[PDB]
Design a protein around this ligand. Structure first.
Ligand code: HUF
Ligand code: HUF
Ligand code: FDA
Ligand code: FDA
Lengths: 211, 211, 218, 216
């Protein structure tokens, strides 16, 4: 499998894929020739005939902090299956470099330490409550937003391109930009013609034209 | 895998992503044993845990009369790409057996002939208009509802099961029931555990428990 | 809430109901900053800002219900818009009335025909008359409606209720209120745009200026 | 119409389009078409699974809920949401503190009153850390990651009667977490008030949960 590490403990892993660039060509024509088929992909992208790209589907396995997953799960045109907090416990601790370009009254390394401290105290409280007989669904409410979760994400190339427009962009939070770069990399590997046509004609973000 | 329907129709499997284990994987979130896995499929189906079945996706190539495709395209939770009537000619002629169980004042063979006569006259009216310089988008409005169309259908196992509940049923028009039987057969071949578990616990129709 | 626009020879687009207006999108957007409605100038500015920068989810809180009478070839195209709700007349249970879209000779203006446009109109009426007569003969003889209706041409009128939010409605206008779309659906999309303009003037104006991809509405 | 939920939460009806008769109109168009016949049609639609007419009834809710509740709720894709952003808003001291009664029926080695206190303590410590980071110049989007899952959020929810009934089947049920059950009871109450025939028919023929057939 194709697996990209994200943040300190996260990842994006390709689980499955149905189709490639020719799946959109076949769907558009309702039925190869490299030059005519690439020309069609570009024609579809430039004129907004996006429905043929829905016949390309991906399944990802993603490990991400809850604050990142909350943003991600806002994308309704997809399928999700997530780990339940009701039925390990790792946390995203930003490195001092996350604060590069910000003027802080305390050194960036003390911000990292303060974050570790509060997650350690939160986690210890959670374990103490669980050991005391408190149900998991109640005890987990003390856990911070940087707690890592895992989910399977099934999405088609059209909804994936919408996700890249919105998340592979400087206005999106830096943490989800990182995940969106890994999504774009896997997408580019499986659908190079669709990805190149997307960048040239439909892509509304900024970071994929620079990175 | 291709199944012939009606006089000139078909259902053909173009592609598939996943199998029964894709739903097992999604329910667990991980990327066990055959008996435990088959038991989990049944457990998910009996308790209405349907989201894991969304990670199994199919692409079909369907050739169907427009009156059948109009009913089929009412299923919004799926992807379609159809032949265009403006730019992109065979018709569904029911056999006398289609009227078995109905008391008609004219012989069922005369009904078949009357239907052929209409398609012949409308088709020739269409060709006359086209030859006279009338644009295709205008001339085609005279064509009857039994005109065959072709489409690509990308659907997940969850929306496919909803389609079987509604169309592989005696309340659905007989013509779409024929198409739904072919969809059920391809589904059964690719996902035998999901299909078997669906029939036992979730299936609301009647014809799949008889045919 | 009520509006009705006549389309083609026998069709229409009628506004049945509407939930919200421009301020519904303002309220939905402001939750982001823990705020709500402010003043008319600031609120109108926010609508334009949302539209220009692609902040489309607030426009989903504005919903419309339409009652449409359209030929089946138009409705087939329309029903491809999945992010909406539909309830249509059934050819299986209803006895179909003599209503078909007959294009007027003016529909072929700009086209060189070997027969007069008036004869195209007449040829269309003749084939629909024969198809309709065959349909009535079959249902009178005991053929089930669901079988007898298959002989009916694509210009047969249908009726449907359409519940759609302002975001999906704007997608519909981008695709159908455009010169590449068939002239008949363009007519329906103009009526949809006109009702939308009346109920959501700020959203409509911002759509035309920043997001609208078609040509005919400009 | 505003219903208070938990210690600081709520469900408020913002807007509604349609009523029971909206579903009656949508259904009768099939056949090119009084109170007793209309109520009978609603029951017929519900019992035979004719659900699309109920999509023409739409609601807008304004909900204040803890993030762990909002996370489960937002899993309902057939709806529209607009939420408070943790990136642009300065967060207020609004956290869900369960009362000792939340642990009734559970054998704990510490008193339930100590569980409530332990939750408040860690909430107080995490909130103080958040404020210290924010005051130090740490961007909000980074600083808020230390905040616990019981932090309250606010959102607008636009949903039709069909997706709302799916939500009640799954959340107004004893298998759903107690906290979201509370929210689903308030949703059911507002739905019952606006669509009494649809609600009554739903309970009698389509409702798969348990708590709405026991709780008034
Ligand atoms: C930089 C940034 C900041 C913020 C946010 C996002 C970004 C990038 N978002 C999330 C978006 O609103 C949206 O949910 C997401 O981008 C998915 O964005 P989205 O585009 O709505 O994705 P989708 O997958 O749900 O749907 C895919 C497509 O399907 C259509 N669609 C689907 N369901 C529909 C329906 N019901 N009605 C109409 N059309 C519908 C529509 O065309 C849509 O593009 C916020 N949301 C919010 O509530 N408050 C906020 O402050 C913010 N903001 C801070 O986080
Ligand atoms: C025997 C029979 C007779 C008739 C018809 C059908 C049959 C079987 N149908 C079609 C159905 O109404 C429905 O469109 C279709 O079955 C898809 O049926 P459907 O069940 O609506 O399927 P979907 O794929 O569109 O969506 C899949 C699931 O997703 C959810 N969903 C999707 N979009 C939603 C949304 N916007 N709001 C809420 N939930 C929504 C919902 O849970 C749904 O089950 C008719 N429709 C109509 O208008 N008049 C009629 O006389 C008839 N009737 C004559 O043909
Ligand atoms: C120039 C040109 C030419 C053609 C076509 C389009 C254009 C622009 N089409 C496409 C077809 O007309 C399409 O079904 C309608 O435009 C419906 O449009 P949406 O998908 O935009 O609306 P819809 O209402 O279905 O969805 C609205 C929005 O939600 C999103 N969406 C909904 N469902 C989705 C899903 N499953 N996956 C990903 N995203 C989803 C999309 O972002 C979409 O814009 C076509 N069709 C055809 O069959 N044959 C043809 O020959 C042509 N030709
Ligand atoms: C008690 C309990 C326990 C859990 C969960 C729920 C509940 C009630 N869930 C969440 C569950 O998987 C699901 O996300 C929602 O609760 C149910 O949302 P629906 O998909 O039914 O509604 P939603 O509003 O998303 O959709 C409504 C209807 O539309 C259809 N639909 C929508 N989008 C679709 C698509 N892309 N494909 C096919 N059909 C679609 C379906 O018919 C569905 O019923 C969960 N989840 C989890 O990940 N792990 C877990 O451990 C649990 N545990």
């Amino acid at each position: 499998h194709m697996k990209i590490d994200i943040l300190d403990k996260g990842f994006v892993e390709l689980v499955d894929v149905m189709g490639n660039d020719l799946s959109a060509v076949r769907a558009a024509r309702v039925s190869k020739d490299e030059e005519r088929d690439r020309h069609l992909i570009e024609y579809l992208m430039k004129h907004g005939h996006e429905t043929p790209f829905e016949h390309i589907v991906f399944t990802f396995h993603v490990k991400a902090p809850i604050f990142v997953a909350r943003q991600w799960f806002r994308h309704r045109i997809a399928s999700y299956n997530e780990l339940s907090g009701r039925y390990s416990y790792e946390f995203y601790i930003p490195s001092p470099e996350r604060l590069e370009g910000y003027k802080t009254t305390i050194p960036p390394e003390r911000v990292t330490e303060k974050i570790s401290e509060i997650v350690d105290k939160a986690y210890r409280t959670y374990l103490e409550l669980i050991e005391s007989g408190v149900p998991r669904e109640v005890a987990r409410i003390v856990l911070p937003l940087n707690l890592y979760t895992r989910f399977f994400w099934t999405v088609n190339a059209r909804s994936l391109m919408n996700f890249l427009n919105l998340r592979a962009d400087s206005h999106a939070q830096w943490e989800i930009q990182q995940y969106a770069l890994a999504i774009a990399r896997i997408f580019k590997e499986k659908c190079p013609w669709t990805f190149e046509a997307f960048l040239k004609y439909a892509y509304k973000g900024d970071i994929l034209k620079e990175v």
